[PDB]
């Protein structure tokens, strides 16, 4: 019907934003927050602490980009696979990401990981982005030792 | 067209198998391998070692279920969300999973995690299942200490 039209319009536009998000590099990273809703949330759902580190609101998201550009100066996402779903406001992306890791008083390291990203949209802006990676890989990249599960 | 018909037939059937997989509990777990192709692969893509622990072939998958039923005796998946994609032979599932963890010479613990599952199908059987979780949560459940990233 007409709901169809809006939902199909929805999907195709939303996809473009996912694409745009995934290809954002360099200083453009400082304006990627403009792709969210005002109230929008982005962050890392897989942490050493077991709680998500979420950043809520387009302005805290812009602020976070400075720290991100500082700590991951050359970060690129590669091997991008975008998954549309039965919900036109929900997408998943499977990819890789690599670049230097510059933590303060840890040595410069090279960080690579496998990531899954969830994007939910509201009115054609990102209402919720979430990323999922294996925190062990980061521990490694910082010269932090990873415990062995002996199965 | 006709390709349409086969792809739509594809999706609806495939979904039923995802559902069936996700609801498999108890001793039924010993026959869940029958949902794969002969050549089929299942396993854990997020590990402490950084390599996937994959089990290849319906018979090694059946064998693995014994160890699984032994080590996670009451395991249930909850909060199941199944994502169909633009590819009718590819599905993602977001869920939780919890149950007891019985590792040999580690104490019995209670293990909970957040999981993402990828299912790819070939001729209506699972050609590749992959799961993604945060290994830190398991380390915890075994009284293994988790290192702190101090960001």
UniProtKB/TrEMBL annotation, chains A, B:
It holds the Pfam family PHZA_PHZB. The keyword Transferase does not apply. GO terms for biological process: antibiotic biosynthetic process. It comes from the Bacteria. Keywords: Antibiotic biosynthesis. Belongs to the PhzA/PhzB family. This is Phenazine biosynthesis protein A/B.
């Amino acid at each position: 019907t007409s709901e169809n039209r809006a939902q199909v319009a929805a999907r195709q536009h939303n996809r473009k934003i996912v694409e745009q998000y995934m290809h954002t590099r360099g200083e453009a990273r400082l304006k990627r927050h403009l792709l969210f809703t005002e109230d929008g949330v982005g962050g890392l759902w897989t942490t050493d602490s077991g709680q998500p580190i979420a950043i809520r609101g387009r302005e805290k998201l812009g602020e976070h980009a400075v720290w991100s550009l500082q700590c991951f100066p050359d970060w690129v996402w590669t091997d991008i696979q975008i998954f549309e779903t039965q919900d036109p406001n929900w997408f998943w992306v499977e990819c890789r990401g690599e670049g230097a890791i510059v933590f303060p008083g840890y040595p410069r390291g090279q960080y690579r990981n496998h990531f899954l990203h969830s994007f939910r949209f509201e009115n054609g802006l990102i209402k919720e982005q979430r990323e999922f990676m294996n925190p062990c890989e980061q521990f490694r990249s910082l010269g932090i030792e990873v415990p062995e599960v002996r199965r």
